[PDB]
Write a protein that binds this ligand. Structure first.
Ligand SMILES: CC(C)=CCC/C(C)=C/CC/C(C)=C/CC/C(C)=C\CC/C(C)=C/CC/C(C)=C/CC/C(C)=C/CC/C(C)=C/CC/C(C)=C\CC/C(C)=C/CC[C@@H](C)CCOP(=O)(O)O[C@@H]1O[C@H](CO)[C@@H](O)[C@H](O)[C@@H]1O
Ligand SMILES: Nc1nc2c(ncn2[C@@H]2O[C@H](COP(=O)(O)OP(=O)(O)O)[C@@H](O)[C@H]2O)c(=O)[nH]1
Length: 346
């Protein structure tokens, strides 16, 4: 039995077409429609209860708690199906792909994502710059949350999941996107993605911080924020050991220009040690030597980046200290990422 969770705000002119084509695609099968409307200044909450004659439609309206992810959480609570399908009422999400979503869940996947960006997937009547802010955020997600590194459209509002995935789980009401909360905090072993087409208005830069604020939150939960802190404490530890050996070498008659080289190299080694027994102690794999060599490529990558970022900022007219500092900060940035996805890959 399938519950099709449709959260709404000001959506009257679609419920007809919506329910018609939901029912059309699911003809015969055991399904319901749980609608969660947050007291719409629109007839929606009433028109749905109206349409509950032709179509299997439950309608909960709430007067005290609103928000999309807030709804879907309740949409889970108030459902009664073996499989949840979540989508949007506007019809940007086609009810006809819903049968693919469940079939996929039938053949053993825990979560079936309706995906813009798998082979088969399409986006139309979207401009290039709105099309690629998308792939760019998605790209911040996949890199920053290694759990979902391999998911093409992990920010979809259109997905199906077994009821088990999200039960006994405190999903977060605020979270900007609920499918994300689920991929991070839910219980599962398999995820597929189904190709669909995004069907036939702007959004300020404030929600961009809201999306990023979500990702920072997922990160604290996942422990990455914790790792990054410790990684930084080593980084400082290395910045110290680099200098301490330099002084120790110039004073023993090693010309600074020769001296710097063992200095930096013992500094890369020091860094490797403490990261491999503190920050990424959990996720070590294979040869320690192969991990060591990996770390070197990451150090080097961090340095090449510091350099390039510094000069490009300078040439843009940025103050040398800001430019030097932004150089260091994006250097720890890239060094971490590579270490996280290559040196200690998972
Ligand atoms: C360069 C280096 C990597 C800097 C390090 C970065 C930092 C410092 C890392 C520090 C360590 C930590 C943070 C680890 C994590 C790292 C991570 C966070 C970032 C690292 C990745 C790096 C920085 C990327 C770059 C490194 C570069 C400089 C290198 C030069 C080479 C290359 C060529 C350079 C390219 C430049 C690069 C690619 C820029 C990446 C960002 C761009 C600018 C796009 C930001 C966009 C986001 C933020 C907008 C908000 C999202 C909206 C869009 C929501 C809305 O989403 P949707 O609408 O789609 O969602 C839908 O919603 C609708 C509702 O209608 C539903 O119907 C749908 O189903 C669906 O749900
Ligand atoms: N109940 C409820 N539904 C919402 C809310 N926000 C959006 N919706 C519904 O979500 C679907 C698409 O949401 P949309 O606003 O386009 O995406 P968003 O930008 O991530 O919030 C539509 O069917 C809306 O009716 C909300 O706060 N409460």
């Amino acid at each position: 039995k399938v519950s099709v969770i449709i959260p709404t705000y000001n959506e009257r002119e679609n419920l007809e077409e919506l329910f018609s084509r939901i029912d059309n695609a699911l003809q015969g099968l055991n399904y319901e429609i749980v609608v969660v409307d947050d007291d719409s200044p629109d007839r929606t909450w009433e028109k749905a209860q109206e349409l509950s004659s032709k179509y299997p439609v439950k309608v909960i309206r709430r007067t005290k708690e609103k928000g999309l992810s807030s709804a879907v959480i309740r949409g889970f609570k108030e459902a009664s199906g073996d499989v949840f399908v979540v989508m949007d009422a506007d019809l940007q999400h086609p009810p006809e792909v819903i049968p693919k979503l469940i079939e996929a869940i039938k053949n053993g996947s825990d979560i079936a994502i309706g995906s813009r960006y798998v082979k088969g997937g399409k986006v139309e009547n979207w401009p290039f710059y709105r099309k690629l802010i998308s792939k760019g955020a998605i790209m911040v997600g996949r890199i920053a949350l290694p759990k979902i590194r391999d998911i093409k459209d992990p920010v979809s509002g259109f997905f199906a999941l077994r009821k088990e995935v999200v039960e006994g789980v405190e999903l977060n009401p605020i979270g900007f996107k609920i499918l994300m909360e689920i991929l991070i905090k839910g219980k599962y072993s398999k995820v597929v993605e189904v190709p669909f087409t995004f069907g036939i208005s702007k959004l300020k830069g404030k929600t961009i911080f809201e999306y990023l604020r979500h990702i920072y939150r997922l990160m604290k939960w996942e422990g990455e924020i914790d790792r990054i802190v410790k990684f930084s404490i080593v980084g400082l530890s290395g910045i110290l050991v680099n200098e301490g050996f330099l002084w120790l070498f110039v004073n023993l008659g090693i010309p600074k220009e020769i001296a710097v080289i063992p200095a930096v190299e013992l500094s890369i080694l020091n860094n490797f040690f403490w990261n491999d027994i503190w920050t990424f102690k959990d996720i070590r794999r294979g040869s320690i030597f192969s991990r060591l060599l990996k770390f070197h490529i990451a150090a080097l990558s961090g340095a090449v980046v510091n350099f390039i970022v510094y000069w490009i900022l300078l040439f843009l007219g940025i103050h040398y200290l800001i430019a030097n500092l932004v150089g260091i900060v994006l250097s720890f940035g890239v060094r971490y990422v590579i270490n996280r996805h290559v040196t200690w890959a998972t």
